[PDB]
Amino acid sequence: LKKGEVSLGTSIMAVTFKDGVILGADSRTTTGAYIANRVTDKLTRVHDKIWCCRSGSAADTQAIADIVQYHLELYTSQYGTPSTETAASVFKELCYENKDNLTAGIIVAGYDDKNKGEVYTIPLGGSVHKLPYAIAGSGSTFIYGYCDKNFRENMSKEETVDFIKHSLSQAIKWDGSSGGVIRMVVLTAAGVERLIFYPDEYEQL
Amino acid sequence: QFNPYGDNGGTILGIAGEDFAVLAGDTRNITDYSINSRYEPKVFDCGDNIVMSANGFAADGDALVKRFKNSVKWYHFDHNDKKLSINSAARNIQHLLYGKRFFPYYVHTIIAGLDEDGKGAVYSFDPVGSYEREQCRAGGAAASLIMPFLDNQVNFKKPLKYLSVEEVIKLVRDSFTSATERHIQVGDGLEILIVTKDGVRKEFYELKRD
Amino acid sequence: MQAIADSFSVLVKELQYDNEQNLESDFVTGASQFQRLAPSLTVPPIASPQQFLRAHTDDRNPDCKIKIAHGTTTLAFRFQGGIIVAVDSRATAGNWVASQTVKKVIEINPFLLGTMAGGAADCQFWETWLGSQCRLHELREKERISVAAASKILSNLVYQYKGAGLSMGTMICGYTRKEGPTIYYVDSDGTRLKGDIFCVGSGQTFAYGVLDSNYKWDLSVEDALYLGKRSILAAASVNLYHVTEDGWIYHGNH
Amino acid sequence: SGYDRALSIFSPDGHIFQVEYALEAVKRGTCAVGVKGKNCVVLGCERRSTLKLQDTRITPSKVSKIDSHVVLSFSGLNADSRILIEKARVEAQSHRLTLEDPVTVEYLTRYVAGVQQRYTQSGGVRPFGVSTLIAGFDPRDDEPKLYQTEPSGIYSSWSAQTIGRNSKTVREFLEKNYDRKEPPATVEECVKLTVRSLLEVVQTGAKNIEITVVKPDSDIVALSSEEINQYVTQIEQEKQEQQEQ
Amino acid sequence: SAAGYDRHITIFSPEGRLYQVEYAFKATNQTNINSLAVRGKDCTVVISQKKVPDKLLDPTTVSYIFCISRTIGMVVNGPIPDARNAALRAKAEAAEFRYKYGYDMPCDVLAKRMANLSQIYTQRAYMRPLGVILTFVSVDEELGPSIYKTDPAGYYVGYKATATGPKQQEITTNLENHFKKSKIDHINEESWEKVVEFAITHMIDALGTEFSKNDLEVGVATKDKFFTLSAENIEERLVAI
Amino acid sequence: MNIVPQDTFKSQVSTDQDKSVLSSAVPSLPDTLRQQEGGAVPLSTQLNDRHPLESTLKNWETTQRQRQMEQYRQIFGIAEPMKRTMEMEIVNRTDFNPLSTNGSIHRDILLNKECSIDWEDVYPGTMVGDDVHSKIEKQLGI
Amino acid sequence: MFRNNYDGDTVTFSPTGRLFQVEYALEAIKQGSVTVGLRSNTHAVLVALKRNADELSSYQKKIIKCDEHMGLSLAGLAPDARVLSNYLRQQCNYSSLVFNRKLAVERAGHLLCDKAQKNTQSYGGRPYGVGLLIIGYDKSGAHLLEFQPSGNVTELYGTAIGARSQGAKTYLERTLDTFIKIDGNPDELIKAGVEAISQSLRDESLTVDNLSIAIVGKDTPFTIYDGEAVAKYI
Amino acid sequence: TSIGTGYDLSNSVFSPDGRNFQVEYAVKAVENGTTSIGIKCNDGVVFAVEKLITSKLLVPQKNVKIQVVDRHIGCVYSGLIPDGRHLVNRGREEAASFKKLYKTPIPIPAFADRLGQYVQAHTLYNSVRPFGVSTIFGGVDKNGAHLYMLEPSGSYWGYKGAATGKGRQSAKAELEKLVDHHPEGLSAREAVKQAAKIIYLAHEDEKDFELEISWCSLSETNGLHKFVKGDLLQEAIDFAQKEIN
């Protein structure tokens, strides 16, 4: 981590459910103790139904995400809609081959008609792990227990929304580098849905 | 910063006789307090009646022995299966060691065989290639225990010339037994390779700690 | 174009054997590693190779330490018809027994001699290499190489690696028809000094004083040998070399 | 036939014709001659008659000093000789720097021949249409050295040699009038022999002749027009006296 | 024909011409099929002729219409190998433009890029031009419906409508007469199906003898997507007037 | 799939590593005069004390190009990188302009840098050498 | 006459669709002397007739050892034989060094085919002009391979290449069932090979100077007999 | 005209009519090769090759004329043997790389496109030669059964039935008849019998021949490429012999 750089202190969650996947995050960017950006969209789209969230160095993850989006556009021009596994593999290759020079961590969420919604996590170092749900960031450490106690397979859309909202609200409550609004993207067969929740709503949970 | 070196803690001994040579070593491989293995040979037959040992960092010694054997293979290919003499092997090993002058192998190397007159010959190498022919050379841990034991019973100046192979083997075994008694890194076995005009013969003797 | 196709057609990369140098060093393709007139030296692929080498060369096993040439007194001078080179043969014992006596002076050619006075491996290796270079030059030019040319070759070579870690101080002594008898001193810092009298060792002031007391150009061969032996004895048995136009002659303890 | 279109083709009788064509190009240059004496070397050159409006003070001479003890003359294309001479001078200085010893005459001849040979090893390059005479003395040596180099990279050692236009007549004259058993023992004899050799082809006389003399300890002297005129007049007077009898 | 050189490489003849370029032009009519491109109010339609004389061929694998990006379609006149080569390079160009400049590649910029590559081929001695003609269609977010054509000589230009093939003159004359009659440089219709039907009708009256659903290929570009129609869609368009 | 260039350090050194400038007197040693570098620059000094960003900047564009070729190989096949490399090599090999150092127009078109400027474009930049014949010898391999 | 216009290089087809430089390279094999190879379920042998420049010269080496379990014999050009033998030695060495593995004979044939095909489709070089016979013993038993420099490799029980090799090949075809079952008796197989190569002789007699033999097998490392070592087989 | 003089000595040259004569000469080289056919059935493909008998010295199991590119992809070719081997190796490399990258067997059209681009790249420069082989390949993927034919120009198409080699005309006529007589489709076993019949009929040239057949079907081989055992091959040979006589 180079001196004077920008780090992605955040709270990232991705949960698979009955009809698809949901990716949620907070909206705070901090330099030290100063909130450099009060309203940030951390949900990065690399393909129509393949989204990601980033951690570590902001510049490195932005460059990696740009390269991944370019790669997936080439793949689509050749073979059509890629699977989430392919995007995860490209992310992993980029993160692992450059790990001695870049600090990047990625959470990838995707949907396709074959695999029906998937979550992959690539922590610092470049290893890849496929999980029914994933949490990352500085504020995730405070919700390792809660999530482990409240996740069920094949939850409905509303139950998944409530679970993500509660978990991210707790992470916001306890982590200094996290705050603002909660953003969520729902990836299903019916399309892409965007959700935003305000502090006056989730702080009362 | 990454440290590319290590230490494995062995003991080797080379002795040149009238018409034979002997290279022996303890067979214990350790990592600084723990026993990795109780039987791991470090003295290797390299062909053309040449025995080699590279004691110290085990990876470097294995690499050096591998490179020397491949070079000998190409030497046989390119020179009508000519026998490689001991002095030529010593020069090859000097070049192999000095090729890593700025990133040296962390080993002490001893080779043994017979010269062109049929007499026993032993060569010792410094880690960056400096080498010389010697009658007797002890290397590694407990060398300071092994050399005085040999000097107490042999006049290198019964004279060493008139000693037989069995007597040399017994003397090496006695010195290694004493060193095993006095040193914590020596033990678990001793392996001796003997080079004569009939070839290379192997002997093994169990030491303390099994 | 087919080579380009091969480059993009899919184990070898991890072994790093797609590089020709790695294949040559491990003797995969042949014994070309032992065919280089200028030897190739491995360097750590990091930002600070010099600091790495210096740190790792000063840290446990006595047998894994780089052997250092004896700092014992070495003397050389030129009287009237050659060069007297004198060393003390008091070898230092260790955990070994020598089959024969060691020599502190390297015999580069039947006409050239050198002294170690530094790192033993550096002196041995590079003076053997210098002997090869001199042999090739003499084959090419059909004439004995001048001592100035040989010393200049050695100095240029050691200067190309200046600061890398080498350590060697040598005295190149020779006798040619055009030059006469000549002595040069070459150091690992690139120094190259021509001289008449050289004394390098632990105690060399005493030997230099004894020489200056009774040095003349009209010395005879026996007188010069006696003076060199006496100077070495004053410094601190004694190996002598007399260099003439026809080569060097070795005296054990004369 | 179809065998003279490249430098990399052998003819069925074992010839490379482009080398012979480069020699043909050399044959059109002005004559050059070199005579080796007992203790000196003399290089003579033929110069085309200077035009009336030509500035005869700054044009390069036909004999160039490679070093303080070696001189070089050429015959053939004048522009290629500049490249060769510059490379020779750079090599002499490089050798002095590398080995602290100035080059020997044979070493410099071999370097020039090596450059000429190296310029015959590609289909995209043109060989030098130049043949050279290299003269001098080895350092701390008193044996005169004279060598000839050819466009193909072949060099030879001579006691007296002529190259260029009408060099066969001069070579026959030298063979008749030069013996290695008794080489000329003084600089004057060598210069007179060189002048008489050049006078067999030179149309006008003393104004189309250039002479350089090399002597040991790096003594290189270019003779003036007046001395060459004196030599020519002496030779003509001797010839007239011989014919009068 | 070329006398000495100019039969292998692209250098000037005594008349100032490049014979290899002209021969590459003549190579574009080998397939002996025609294509037409027209613009609607919010769509662009390309219609190409399918000829499958061989009964052993699989008709679904025969196509000269390619999808380059989300918004750009391409039609190629000429042999199919160079067509596929050009298609792959165009896909790479569009993707690299999007990566490098942060927004989608416009149709005219891609046409200019391909034309510059063709200029390279026309000037370098050891490179040959591709014997194909490329037509790019899209609905640009700034310029609206767009048709741009590029040829082996490196020349590119935009069209209100265009036709290419061995019978391009007849279709061009028919289109010119229609645009004279209507005094509008496009088609005044609100759906791309009507534009497709109009293009089919124009092709039928120009070429003659009509065709079935298996002799035609139709690609349609909207503001969001370029898509190729299937045999059933073409059958519906033929049935619907 | 590299973003920042990697493996930029030398692993071996020798006195004949620069084939272009080698001494004719001693072929195993470099020619100091014809190097024209000040005369007091041993090769060892080039192995230490470099700016960390220099290797990254010197190899940046080659690394991006290699990543693009690798992506083409993964998505398109062997033929696409083969053809790109063949085009670039033909263009580079047919150009020989000893009096200028600027890149050709066709090279810029192939690199997709027709309307792009970097500091290499703005800043493109003796007794012996630097002549046409040295460039001829280096280009032809003689 | 029309062939004279389309045989300049290896990147040119004639109007009839023929690659003449490769055909000429194949024809170059006939200029070499005859070599025979054969094998059984346990051993594989090569027999070679060697030629000398004249009475005062030595005889050419026709059998080259690649590895302790594999070797070959040549018929054709000398430079290409040297190149291919060195390449096979390098491949065997790489296999042994990297994997501690013995290179299979099939793998060696595939590598030779890959290296040979390249020179027949690119400008600037020429096709190889040597035929090779490769014998070896590996985990699948004994193997004999015939390599043709067009880039082709065939696996056979026996074969012969070189000038006037048709008689030896006919003899091997006629007596296949005999030598295919010679297991555990190297001498019988070697004698069968010598008799097979005797069919290709024309005004020539096998001597200790012009006969070379090689054998490989289960317990037999690849061994070459020359001189008096073949006197027992004459 | 089949022979284009002045435009047939270089690979990447256009004729005045816009033709590439070296590619056509490679096509003529293909047309002299051995007959090969491929048939597409309702759920798979069948390949058939007319092998020519050789000496008994050949090891029977080590000389197969149908190459397996991958577990679901099989191919045959007619033309030059080295070119066919090279193209098969390239196809194997492409399939392996695709399976490594995307963790699924490569679809047949993607493989066809990669092979076709590789073939087409060899018609672009004068330093290479067009491939002298025509290839019939195919297999089964998630979308079903695919059969393709690829030509020296890089042109490839999907086929209901494909034929190449000397006996291509008769084989193509028989394939057209088979397609006409079965508008609904065909089964794998009927395809094998008809492939044997067509190979037998196409043969017209004193030389004894054998037959090789290969299957790839979902119902018969679980979507994998297999050879024909003794029983099915013998039955197909009997059917073909009944057809001939």
Added chain:
Amino acid sequence: MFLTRSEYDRGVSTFSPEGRLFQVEYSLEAIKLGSTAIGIATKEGVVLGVEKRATSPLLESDSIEKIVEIDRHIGCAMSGLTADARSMIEHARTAAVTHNLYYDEDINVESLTQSVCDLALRFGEGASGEERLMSRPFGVALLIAGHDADDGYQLFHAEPSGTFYRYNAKAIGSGSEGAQAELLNEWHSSLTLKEAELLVLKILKQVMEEKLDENNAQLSCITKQDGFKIYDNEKTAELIKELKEKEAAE
């Protein structure tokens, strides 16, 4: 059925219809244009002898170097283009010195000959797979005479094709045919050194246009103890006088 022109003999990488490379043949023809060199191998050493063709009497006598010292135990004689032989000799000397440097022993004569032939192969693909180094084959032939402990006294012939032979006696150059016939007639395994020298002088005198003397001929020999030496003009003149007396005895 018409007479046209064939052009298969102009490129080094072009096959004739029968599979021949005619540029190698033409290089051998270039070899035959050079002067004559004769080598005879016996049990007491190897003798080499060359003819000096001086086009002009002004040429320096001690300037034609057809016999060179590759190493103390290895000498060479050359015939053909001298510029190529210069490079070959430099390569051979480098190989010998490098072998001594890395193995502390003399290199075998056959190993040196093989290295020279591998260099001569460089107009095509190298022995170790190297790229082409030169545009045409060499136009020189070499006679390499040496002694080693493994094989005694050996004489090898090296050709531009990259192939070498071992010979008891061998002649190359312009007058190689008659000289080789004489060597076939007059060589036996029990020759002495002086008899070999006399035979070399006799064959050179037979095959030389000019009258043989100490100035147009040169002799050299290699032996185990004295190494490789080239006889001065006085010794060769004495040998020629002895040969003349022996011839006049009959």
